[PDB]
Amino acid sequence: SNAMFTINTKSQLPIYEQIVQKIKEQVVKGVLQEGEKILSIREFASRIGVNPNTVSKAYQELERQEVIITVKGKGTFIANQTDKLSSPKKLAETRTKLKETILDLVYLGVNIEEIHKLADEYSQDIIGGDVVEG
Amino acid sequence: SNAMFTINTKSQLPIYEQIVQKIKEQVVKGVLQEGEKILSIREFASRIGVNPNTVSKAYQELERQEVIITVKGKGTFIANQTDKLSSPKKLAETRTKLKETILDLVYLGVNIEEIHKLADEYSQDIIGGDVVEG
Questions:
Q1: A122 touches chain B (CB under 8 A)
Q2: Does B122 contact A at CB distance below 8 Å?
């Protein structure tokens, strides 16, 4: 029930990571909702034309990050989103990534004003439009 | 002539990358200036107590990114900073890293307001204070 998406084989991001990040973004958009059943590893691999082992790797990483949950013989679902406590360690690691990225941009001559602008643009692209039912 | 710095062996960043990023940050701060001679690989490894091969790896990456320049038999220097053209490919890759990092934070429940705040804080920490001579 995930929406199909673009995969870029020349990206710096491995295919499995692209899958992880697109699923995450779709949850952020509300395109995928808590409890929603998504495609099985094999169904998904078959549909997008990707190595099933690559999709398995992505789903394992998604479950590790608690984005999805697998219930044996029942399927794979989007995990609890409402009252989840974000992993402090993941938050810490992600803040470090933000810091390092800002250092890289600043070194390359991008000023903080331009960085705020980019952050707004990317934030808006991630949040997307709006999805409803009924 | 680089300033000594903290290395965190439990960081998600490999030691060589920590060295690359600290040198870059010191250039951003003006602690290291264009043309300034820095420690040789062996001098630096000896001083910080790191594997010389790790320092060599960092210096290779710094030269790849055009942060430093090595002149055979003369030493290693901070590369041109004034009229350098930032690699469009590196800029593009770094912008992608910003986007992915923002997605990760937003997924973890950090709002764009908090992200702008973090960006300002990290930007200020990178820029640092002020270094002069005379």
A1: yes
A2: yes
